[PDB]
Amino acid sequence: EDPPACGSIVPRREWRALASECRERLTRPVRYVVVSHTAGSHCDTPASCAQQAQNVQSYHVRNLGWCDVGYNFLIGEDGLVYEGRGWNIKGAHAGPTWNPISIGISFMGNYMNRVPPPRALRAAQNLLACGVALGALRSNYEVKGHRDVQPTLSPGDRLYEIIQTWSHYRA
Amino acid sequence: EDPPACGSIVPRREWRALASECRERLTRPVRYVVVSHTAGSHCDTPASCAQQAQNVQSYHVRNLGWCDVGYNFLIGEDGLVYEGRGWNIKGAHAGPTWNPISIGISFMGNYMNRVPPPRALRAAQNLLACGVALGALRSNYEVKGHRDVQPTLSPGDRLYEIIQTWSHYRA
Amino acid sequence: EDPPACGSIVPRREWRALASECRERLTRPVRYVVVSHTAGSHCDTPASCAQQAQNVQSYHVRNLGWCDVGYNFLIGEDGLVYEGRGWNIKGAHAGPTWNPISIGISFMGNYMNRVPPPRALRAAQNLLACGVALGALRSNYEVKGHRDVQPTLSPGDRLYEIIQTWSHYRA
Amino acid sequence: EDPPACGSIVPRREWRALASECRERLTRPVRYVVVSHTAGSHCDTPASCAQQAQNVQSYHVRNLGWCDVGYNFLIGEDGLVYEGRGWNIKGAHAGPTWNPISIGISFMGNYMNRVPPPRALRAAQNLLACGVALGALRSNYEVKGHRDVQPTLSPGDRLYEIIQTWSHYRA
Numbered sequence: 001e002d003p004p005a006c007g008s009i010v011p012r013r014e015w016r017a018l019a020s021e022c023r024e025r026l027t028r029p030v031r032y033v034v035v036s037h038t039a040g041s042h043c044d045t046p047a048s049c050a051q052q053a054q055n056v057q058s059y060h061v062r063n064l065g066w067c068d069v070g071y072n073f074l075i076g077e078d079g080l081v082y083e084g085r086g087w088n089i090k091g092a093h094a095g096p097t098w099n100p101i102s103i104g105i106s107f108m109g110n111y112m113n114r115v116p117p118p119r120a121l122r123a124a125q126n127l128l129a130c131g132v133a134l135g136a137l138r139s140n141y142e143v144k145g146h147r148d149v150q151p152t153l154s155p156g157d158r159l160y161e162i163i164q165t166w167s168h169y170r171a
Numbered sequence: 172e173d174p175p176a177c178g179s180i181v182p183r184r185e186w187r188a189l190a191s192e193c194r195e196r197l198t199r200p201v202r203y204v205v206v207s208h209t210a211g212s213h214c215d216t217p218a219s220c221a222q223q224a225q226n227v228q229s230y231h232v233r234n235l236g237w238c239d240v241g242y243n244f245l246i247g248e249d250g251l252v253y254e255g256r257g258w259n260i261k262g263a264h265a266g267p268t269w270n271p272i273s274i275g276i277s278f279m280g281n282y283m284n285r286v287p288p289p290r291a292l293r294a295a296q297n298l299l300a301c302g303v304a305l306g307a308l309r310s311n312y313e314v315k316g317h318r319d320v321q322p323t324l325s326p327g328d329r330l331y332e333i334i335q336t337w338s339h340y341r342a
Numbered sequence: 343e344d345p346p347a348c349g350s351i352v353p354r355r356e357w358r359a360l361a362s363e364c365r366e367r368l369t370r371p372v373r374y375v376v377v378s379h380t381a382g383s384h385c386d387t388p389a390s391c392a393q394q395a396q397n398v399q400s401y402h403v404r405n406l407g408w409c410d411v412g413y414n415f416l417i418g419e420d421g422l423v424y425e426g427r428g429w430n431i432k433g434a435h436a437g438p439t440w441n442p443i444s445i446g447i448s449f450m451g452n453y454m455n456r457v458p459p460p461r462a463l464r465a466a467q468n469l470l471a472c473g474v475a476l477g478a479l480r481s482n483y484e485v486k487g488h489r490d491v492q493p494t495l496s497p498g499d500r501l502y503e504i505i506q507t508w509s510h511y512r513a
Numbered sequence: 514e515d516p517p518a519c520g521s522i523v524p525r526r527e528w529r530a531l532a533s534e535c536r537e538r539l540t541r542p543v544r545y546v547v548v549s550h551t552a553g554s555h556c557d558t559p560a561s562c563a564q565q566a567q568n569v570q571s572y573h574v575r576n577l578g579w580c581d582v583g584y585n586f587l588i589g590e591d592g593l594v595y596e597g598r599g600w601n602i603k604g605a606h607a608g609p610t611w612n613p614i615s616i617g618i619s620f621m622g623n624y625m626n627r628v629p630p631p632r633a634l635r636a637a638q639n640l641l642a643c644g645v646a647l648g649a650l651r652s653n654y655e656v657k658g659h660r661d662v663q664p665t666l667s668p669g670d671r672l673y674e675i676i677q678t679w680s681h682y683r684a
């Protein structure tokens with residue numbers, strides 16, 4: 001009811017999200033951040049990215065029968081962050097070992113032979129800083145790529161090589 | 172001064188801004204924020220908006236012969252903030268009494284019979300909070316419409332009505 | 343480990359409060375708390391403090407023509423808390439800038455050269471914990487002395503000296 | 514066009530006032546005058562009174578983040594009137610309902626127990642007569658004490674006693 005949130009996050013409802021049914025709660029301040037890719041289509045406008053966020057949530061809900069879109073946050077090439085399960089709900093993007101001790105953010109697209117535009121890298125880094133600000137992440141939070149906690153090509157070769165340059169990257 | 176380099180802002184070179192020739196400085200921290208519209212063409216995608224920002228800087232530099240685009244920041248319906256003279260440099264958006272003491276942000280479009288989309292208002296509000304965090308703005312800063320401090324329709328009847336409900340708005 | 347787990351508050355009706363005509367609401371969770379004193383006399387019994395809360399209300403309603411007593415809560419030296427406008431209604435105790443974003447608590451009396459008794463300070467700290475427990479105050483809310491946001495000697499030299507030692511005081 | 518020189522006022526320049534950042538104007542002729550005291554320590558010489566006017570401003574500007582000392586004028590025990598925000602700029606002394614429609618003058622000192630010397634009272638009345646002659650105040654202006662429009666001991670009991678007898682006062 002006062003000014004909106006840091007990181008300018010597109011709220012669940014704005015991208016016509018089916019309502020969440022998840023209950024497990026994340027014990028924030030959380031240690032880790034896991035960067036992955038959706039391996040779906042990429043989009044570069046808010047109209048094309050609201051549609052894509054909807055589509056990723058629907059594959060997770062209708063087909064895998066999950067309680068909500070598996071990722072805590074989604075990032076579109078349009079340069080905006082899309083609210084997934086948010087800062088407080090356990091995710092479903094990294095396995096039983098990690099989901100409980102991580103926030104999962106996922107870049108919408110396949111980044112094996114492509115890179116996300118700087119604005120998508122920007123929205124991401126800012127979403128992470130707006131994390132501690134709120135007090136959802138720990139000050140010295142570590143960033144792991146998907147393929148560092150699980151056997152998978154995610155987040156793609158090109159994007160995986162960028163996030164290693166990030167200051168908080170590890171292992 | 173302080174760590175939290177804040178929010179996402181599309182940089183000058185990305186929107187392909189002509190090099191600025193401005194040198195007068197504002198004194199940190201700034202008390203006032205004047206909100207305006209460009210009464211120009213609107214845009215809803217990262218690509219279309221960079222073009223628009225460029226057109227605005229162009230009309231300003233090339234035809235009005237100012238040192239740079241007149242606004243400190245522009246705001247696109249694409250939901251992204253565009254850098255202008257930035258936080259440190261005196262803009263040219265509100266006349267001689269106000270340009271020396273304010274930060275002028277301008278929504279790109281004609282908000283007479285249209286409100287800007289939610290994401291636009293969010294970036295706009297988000298940018299100000301970042302201003303505060305950086306120390307560019309006063310914690311108790313004040314938001315003013317363009318029409319409050321100059322004879323004009325700017326920033327549109329619709330968006331003027333909207334900014335009136337901002338907690339930092341003082342008439 | 344369940345619903346109403348906090349504090350003891352003398353309700354409006356129990357102190358004969360005149361009906362409230364205020365309706366504007368605070369946005370929970372509220373981040374700020376402003377500590378004042380009534381600067382008038384004190385009281386140290388259910389009936390005297392209940393009589394006084396009524397005066398302070400009379401002064402604000404009849405003499406000042408206000409919709410309800412200015413404070414969200416008043417603290418008696420009888421060690422009880424008097425429900426003022428409460429947790430959810432914007433008070434009038436700190437100006438147009440702080441009233442909308444804070445909870446105003448007034449200790450009944452004058453503490454320029456006098457401290458409130460141990461139990462009035464417990465009542466007030468206990469009220470705060472209760473505000474957090476309920477999600478009416480941010481877990482990391484801030485305490486401000488009235489003289490820190492308005493020109494006044496309120497809350498009196500001595501009480502002002504005490505609130506500054508508080509875990510939640512931010513100067 | 515009647516030309517008088519009612520202004521025996523110590524100019525901001527002369528009391529070493531920091532520069533005002535206030536820009537909101539009062540509409541003349543103003544109908545109300547609100548009398549407050551600074552509740553603070555006092556002065557009785559041009560030298561010490563200029564210094565006190567400095568601290569009173571320092572408090573409002575430095576400790577509180579205000580655009581200028583709060584009062585339109587201040588009254589010294591030395592018999593001189595100090596220029597505050599003046600006749601034309603809305604002061605910040607008596608709240609959002611009264612500030613836009615009143616001139617707030619404040620006696621430098623705490624008058625709960627002393628009365629200000631006759632020369633401070635004369636300075637105040639000649640100050641008001643002057644305003645009326647300039648066309649700044651309605652010939653029939655009403656004088657309110659601070660405690661009459663906001664909850665406060667200001668302007669002090671004894672000086673409150675005195676202003677209640679004034680010709681222009683009104684319940």
Ligand SMILES: CCCCCC[C@@H](O)[C@H](CCCCCC)C(=O)O
Binds near residue numbers: 004005300
């Ligand atoms: C700024 C005033 C907003 C009012 C309180 C809303 C609050 O959620 C804020 C949201 C994001 C602000 C973070 C500063 C960059 C935060 O906790 O960080």
